[model samples]
Target: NLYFQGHMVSKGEELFTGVVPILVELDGDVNGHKFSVRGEGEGDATNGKLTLKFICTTGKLPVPWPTLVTTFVACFSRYPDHMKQHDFFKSAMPEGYVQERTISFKDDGTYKTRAEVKFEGDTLVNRIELKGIDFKEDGNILGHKLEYNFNSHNVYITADKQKNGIKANFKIRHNVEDGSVQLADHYQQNTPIGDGPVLLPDNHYLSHQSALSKDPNEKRDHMVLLEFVTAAGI
Candidate 1:
């Protein structure tokens, strides 16, 4: 079990939605590896969305395990809203990878969210899903799932135990006094992303790039993860 506490600020734009700055803490298994992830500072949100910029700095994956670091780093590198950015679709994706996003909100406040990445000119696809939105006046709970065809990994996560094999749950609540939303949850498996050797190279490189964008001191956590992974010849 693990506990995470972060603030989600609500903001949006013409083409994008605003995100709250989050400071996360991890004290359990991530991808079946036990480790700790702690935020470095009061992170900032970009264009009302969370980005790799905030995540990489706001938290440190204390282990040097290549596969572990690479997997989570890459997963955290981009937020759902990032797909709307032109440069992200143009350059953020790897040489042969194309990104796709789908979002639908029902009248009952339920919704579905999916993000897919495909090998350029190929059928191989990596998809992530966020569904079962129980949006309420004070908070929301959404179902999370991920499918990576290249690595053949599938994960189903929910706040309810019977919904998936993985016993993980996430929840969000609005704090009226502070004007922030409380985001918290715990997952037995990786919550940010799943593990797969197929995406290691891309994830590693992308994570490295994200770390480079932060300040020197702030980059230490990310740099350590990347350097250790590279040193292990991963």
Candidate 2:
């Protein structure tokens, strides 16, 4: 059970609508501890449509940083909103905890990595794929896992939008690997536009694993869960 307490406006409450969710308890340490969040704010319809904004900057989540890390790994594509909160967990975890598992720079001018980085000619692209994993009991086989995958292909007009600024259209593909094989696919331009926004600041995100989880749940079945999250701004 985890909670985010702060000045959250009522208008933007809906923003939290798709972000957090409640799931059945698991057999690991998080037993009886469900997933939930709460915010405080005061506003009226007169204030116009209040946009609820969650700023997750780059850094490290608190240690045993794995606490929030595991939660995120288990809830990745299952909960599309988790991608928006990467900076939050990134700040709570340690550096090099999650490293880039694979990075592919195609000869066609495009690339992909645990960073979800892309390229077009000499210019780097903003589109990205941010992947993370959190394990419980270190070597424990059954546990919670979460992943957050963000991309600008649909939401942003140009890769530049993914610079220091923000852009919508990113999606979250969360899946729990409970003995079933999960496959992922994506497409990008033929040139490196430039480097996308450094989602996890200070290179805190360390690595990625082929498997997300070892337990089975309702969200875990024959089909792979491919959830999406939208991002847009500067």
Candidate 3:
């Protein structure tokens, strides 16, 4: 079991120290959601907000959504019998839709997204976008980075808590290929690629389905486009 402690702080205090206790409680009605010691301190006053650091006795395995989905699909799809039960699975065949689900913090300090399944009904679908998986603190949403592509053997999950709530807006993207998908920032560069380009909704890549020409001949081929919007406020 992991334990974390937060000290009680008073306004206008320096907060040199105090011992906070770790407590475990039932997490409401949510199954498997245990309440652990999670808190924050402002050193008694926001006039001079002091950053609080937490010490965890136990560590958690950082897992990304794409890898989690890939592992689940791989295990379930291995058995031919399991694939026959669901109509959505049967119609898509061995190759199905690529889904890129992202949760992020917006500048207005609101959170929203929904889990979307790319393909619906019997059709060739390429991409799936999930939106509105919100969080109370924007920090919680930006605490990690997720990029996984089952095709090129690229899988990595990293944390960036330092950048949390700092950026005006947070963005995430997924690149789908013939049989696999890759995840990255809209603006990443360099090998072992660092963060990608930050994409805005008004950007040409988003606004123009056919950027160069409006003719059918100039349309993008084999591309699955996904767009996200916030539905509620935190």
Worst 10 contiguous positions by lDDT, candidate 3: 203-212
Candidates 1 and 3 compared: the better one by lDDT is 1
Best by TM-score: 1
Off-target runs (Cα >4 Å) in candidate 2 are 1-221
Tens-place lDDT per residue, model 3, 1-234, is: 965432222211112122211111111111122211121212211111122212111223222223222211110111122212211211222222222223333331221211111112322122221222233232222332333322222222121234310111224333333332233322111110113221111111111010111224423211111111111110
Query: Relative to the unseen true structure, what is the C-alpha lDDT of residue 187 in candidate 2, on a scale of 0 to 100?
Result: 29
| Full candidate order by TM-score, most accurate first | 1, 3, 2
Q: Runs in model 3 with CA error above 4 Å?
A: 1-76, 81-88, 92-124, 133-138, 145-234
Evaluated at residue 58, the lDDT of candidate 1 is 33
Tell me the whole-model lDDT of each prediction, alpha carbons only. 0.25, 0.23, 0.21
Candidate 2 lDDT, 7-110, residue by residue in tens? 23221223232333222111112222222211111112121111111112222221111222212221122112333433322121111012122211111111
Clashes of each: 8, 44, 13
TM-score preference between candidates 1 and 2, better one: 1
| lDDT by residue for model 1 (1-234), tens | 966432122111121222223233333332233344433221122321123222333344422222222122122233333332211221222222221112122221332323343222211123333333334332221211111111112122222123211122223222222343333221332211212111111111121221223346654454222111111011
lDDT of 3: 0.21
